Symmetry: D3
Subunit: 304 residues, 6 copies
């Protein structure tokens, strides 16, 4: 089912010793749980340009060894691991648990090898397995999640974030851009000392006057695409109007401080729900392609 994906992942050479005490490198793979079988996002992202908002450039490599560039050239090595699902191994459509353990292995592999995992696409359950993987290899390390979502997503006890909280696994969590808050959410937001920046807060209180995010701990970044306004990311199953611009998000992302990025999860993208140009290119693919690129930049250039 995923075999082909995990096999080469296991055959990935660990990061070189030349990478002495410096951030990176970044391993990138496609994850498609809860989403239709056609997952263009990973493939779409790779064809997109390399130049970033900040003055640096991505370099994507299908194979190792990932050489460490001089701490000055501003290249950003990224290991393409391809799509987790092999769109050839029959028409088998993996289970929830089948997706979890598949993702769990990839992250456990890439982390032990020293790479910073960036899952792309999916329904956000990758956030769960990727975080549990990290605390498995680094039980001492504390983790804080900056979670971009229009939904606080902690009501359902099965929700990836709520689970992490329930299992006493997080040092803290920041909820950026919520605009659909329920009674259950408020209760959980109370019970768990959760810092949160709802939309009316962000927009009315400053916009530019965003004092960054003070984080002293390794950071996991998870971005539900519906955090963006439906006019920027319409390819979502649960859209809520009054969201972030792509620029809005790009800004807040840059202000995330911390020692290291434990991993990154960009999800919520459904191609059957997108808004397409006349050349059949979707708005949300254009939006999320940018965000993924700058997410990788944060993994390479995060600080405190």
């Amino acid at each position: 089912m995923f075999s082909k994906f995990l096999m080469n992942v296991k055959g990935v050479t660990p990061r070189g010793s030349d990478w002495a005490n410096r951030l990176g490198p970044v391993a990138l793979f496609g994850y498609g749980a809860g989403m239709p079988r056609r997952a263009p996002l990973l493939d779409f992202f790779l064809q997109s340009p390399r130049d970033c908002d900040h003055y640096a450039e991505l370099t994507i490599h299908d194979k190792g060894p990932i050489e460490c560039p001089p701490e000055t050239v501003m290249f950003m090595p990224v290991l393409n691991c391809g799509q987790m699902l092999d769109e050839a191994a029959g028409t088998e459509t993996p289970t929830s648990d089948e997706w979890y353990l598949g993702s769990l292995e990839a992250s456990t592999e890439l982390l032990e090898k020293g790479y910073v995992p960036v899952s792309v696409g999916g329904d956000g359950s990758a956030t769960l397995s990727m975080v549990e993987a990290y605390k498995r290899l680094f039980p001492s390390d504390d983790i804080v999640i900056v979670h971009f979502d229009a939904h606080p997503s902690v009501s359902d006890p099965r929700s990836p974030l709520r689970v992490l909280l329930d299992k006493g696994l997080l040092k803290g969590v920041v909820s950026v851009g919520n605009r659909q808050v329920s009674s259950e959410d408020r209760k959980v937001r109370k019970l768990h000392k959760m810092f949160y920046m709802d939309m009316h807060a962000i927009y009315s209180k400053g916009l530019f006057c965003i004092r960054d995010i003070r984080n002293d701990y390794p950071v996991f970044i998870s971005i539900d695409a519906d955090v963006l306004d439906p006019a920027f990311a319409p390819a979502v199953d649960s859209p809520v109007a009054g969201g972030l611009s792509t620029r809005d998000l790009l800004h807040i992302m840059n202000g995330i401080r911390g020692p290291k990025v434990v991993g990154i999860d960009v999800y919520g993208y459904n191609p059957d729900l997108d808004v397409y140009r006349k050349d059949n290119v979707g708005l949300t693919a254009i939006a999320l392609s940018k965000i993924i690129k700058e997410g990788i930049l944060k993994a390479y250039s995060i600080s405190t």
Copy 2:
């Protein structure tokens, strides 16, 4: 023609005495003058979530009696009155005057029963009849209109707003978000002491630094969908680029002060003009669904 709609409306139980000196409740109906017969907005709005931007929840009821929830639970009772036009009573397509008197009755009924009327869909002529209805039952009460529109809409002497002004019916009017101002408009804006916030004013002067709207009088809120940027609400017959985000509008809405809301009119939505996702959901329906919800919130939580 509308008969079926008005009949049950007449059979609506007045607000209970339990509602002692407190805001609400809210009655909601569909109005489709000047728009194609298929009016999904009302139906689309009802299927949308109940949780609001601010920490409260809507409750929609097809029937009375609308019990008053404890002044703490944060539920927001809404009486669904359904679509004014009965899409079954032949293919008769009502007249301008036929729409006016139909709307006029509904508002007169719901107001005497104590409900706050919220018209949804249409071309904005509901604003005219709903306001005249209020001043009919409350001739002593002064009224101020916060009017969201890309067009000042007071040039044509037949325009609902201009008529209200011409008939000496308003204590004042605020024009938010205009970006197509004609010579005739400026003349009328002069003649009638009209306060107004054009787009370049709003955007350049603050954005966040919006000192709210100081209103001492009962407020009618009318929102032409074209006040929003065509990228947020493309389903408009007269789009003008450079408008409000859904967030932009949501913000300014929250800063509307006053004793009570006399009524709310959300209009300008044309489904034949919308931009649709691949699952045939329109951008403007997603946008206006949010706005309607928060409009209802203002009726329940307005102050000075």
Copy 3:
């Protein structure tokens, strides 16, 4: 090929002596290099309303003589020159050089006659020929370009902007809204004292707190449509997410200071790439129609 266009352009009466020492008038034409043969933008713009953001009105005239309105009525005379390409002269599709010399003549003609040229549509090469034309008639005059683009567009030595720089033709250039900056770009940005406002700068540093653009020299305004966010102008071959709102651009445009506008170039629009409403109207056409109108306003009302 273009003959029909240039012929009447040559037969255009020069601006009257009544236009004593005052800004304008404005000549407008359609330019389609690098774009599909169907170029609706010019035609779409003309059907759009006349009223501006600022309190003035456009007047479009197919023929002279362009009378000077009293310095108070706030009318803005615009000479429609029509589409450069005659969509009738066979299916001949002009060359790069064929487009350059065609454009070069039109600008040279209209400038000597006293008009301010505004090219509409195309791939931005009109910027090159229009500027060289101006310095041909006014070799003493210094020129500064305010360039709106998501790409700095100076890497390729053939690029219109880079060429102008390389040929020592500009007093200065301002690059507004870049978000894809390469190594080559940074080198050229260094070598040529180029002032520039990237997207993260604009958005994080102020937004409203934009101290205008201090220009002491005649200004050429060139606007690649991709400076706008793909949600506002998706009809671009190279979209980059995280761009300007139409409002964003409108704002920054207003803050352009200078003695006179040497010319205006609005380009980057590809109808085969647009996002269309259900009535087959494209988002980018709605956006750029507004921008073109306000661009004309700047030519008539620029100052220092």
Copy 4:
């Protein structure tokens, strides 16, 4: 008695026909009610420079005729109301003296500017204007650390109570009592307190919307005691001189009916080693820009 002062005022030539449909001119005099006989402020201002914050210049004249120039600012010096017996006027003597003086100057076409005093000049000058122009509506922009409407004797409270004002704006209050709030409610007065201004960020106050003729009243104690200590009953946490200068610039209206700068007590000032007081330096600046406003107010 003031005797000599009124003589000069009564003998003042009316504004020229060249002045038709132009703002101004400005009549300036010294008023010392509630303050010690030594009132240096008028003299100190006159000694102060002529160039303004905005790019224009004052021109001061002890006598007419005040000709109208094409970017200069003509000012008629009318001198000190009280002349040097040892007469110490009563409240009514100061009132009727000011009321008469202002009534003259208004008819002459000038814009009256009272300097010094305890703020009672505001009462007589507004009453003077509304006596001559009952058709005109009047709005007062009042700069003060105190709402100054508790005491029924207060010039403002009186003006409000006699149904004489279309509205009042209270800028920079930071000592509001229960009684103050009561009066603020019934007379429906807009007000921008100190905690408000600073929290709202001072810069994003472009202006104050106004369509009626404006009277400007500035209790010196609106400024922080570190900028204007020469005040009876000072309240800390006030405006910088720039803060006030800024907010003044944003005052809109057709015309200025008059200006009253008061609250200055030299026996309470903080003096440099050369015996120049901080408050005299501050208020000298403020007065100059008030005059500029009289010449350049608009909507």
Copy 5:
């Protein structure tokens, strides 16, 4: 010795049962360690007006019982700690005196407010609170131009070192040494220096997020010397009185454990011609709003 002062404090009636689950009441006393025997501040504040910046009013009582009212603010005046032999107490005499006094007042249900001194009152008052409530966590909001943690003798450094604080916020520092930064690192203290505040724009500081009981400590030298010159070792480029007033308003928390206003030296003040000091006017204002905070703190 203080003798008489403690007598009154020990004989203070505890808070009424009407006060149950309401913030307050407030106990107020004068503390003069490190300062000359002439300590006018307490008396000066008491003479100052009662109306606050926010719309409420103080009510001062020399004796109980302090009844709980439905928008008034009850304040218990406990008077000057030192009574007029020529006894000049030692550091330990001031410490044990304050420590005892505060321990009493806390048990009585009152919120202690020390006035005057050198900031050593902060030490004893926090220690008093944590002595009675070891379960309670404590966070200190510290206004000072100096981080004041270099000297191991400093009240703050001691409090931190004894593992007594959940956290500390240092607002308005503008003289930070290498040693200061070292201590700031290991004890993980949040701090908002002067260059930060102004560059971040003062207005967009809505509040400071806090869930634990708060002690407020205000070294007077945090204000610019032009607002509070009566300080030993002044540092220019500080807060306006409004600036401080603003930042104070944004202090969040369940309850105020106590307040210490210090750094005031009358021999160093700048005086008006009527011998009233600038710093007394400034700090009199600040003290009033601190009391309002004790009554209206929340989250």
Copy 6:
């Protein structure tokens, strides 16, 4: 004559080879033209603390060799130009004295910092630099309440007229005359007046874009008289000390050619009860951060 002062300056060891391609070092001296013989400022600053606003520290040396350290800030004290006969130097004596002194210190590799005076030090120091480095272009950032270019005798007007400057920035002007505007036009000088700064909101001034070597000139009267009253001809509505501190921080450039802090007159100051002047406290702070800028200027 200055005699002794120049002796020390001429005998100053040049900057070490360790200093190669590093900003600094800094030479500091006292200059007293146009001011009374009692010039406490230099001594007062030297007595003031060493820690800066930004996290670094000054180290002051009366003599060399000034070794280059890996976050300390070496400062060479050159002392008072005038030594205690009763000689009172002429304009030319102060000019040629300063011009010679600065020419030496520049060749030694040091960055000259004049302290005190009437602003004529700006003239000689710039002339000194352009005498040694005609290839270098120079831009002056000038802090002043007066554009100070009306008088053809003014140091700035002279510098401009002799075609010696690539550009000039005038920050904080609030008294602009017709003649000033004329000179501002022809010499094309950028300027940020007071009404501009405050209306533009002070916080959103990240920096000033500049690619040429910078001379920093600070007339003390740019600050509000409530912060710096010790100035001849004060103008109200100026910068807070923080305001100036902030704007200074945003000065960009490759190197600082020199710094001139002037306008301080102790006979005009406002003194605390212990006879310490407000302006000495303010300007002592400002001088320290100027030195930090010399060490940390960039683009």
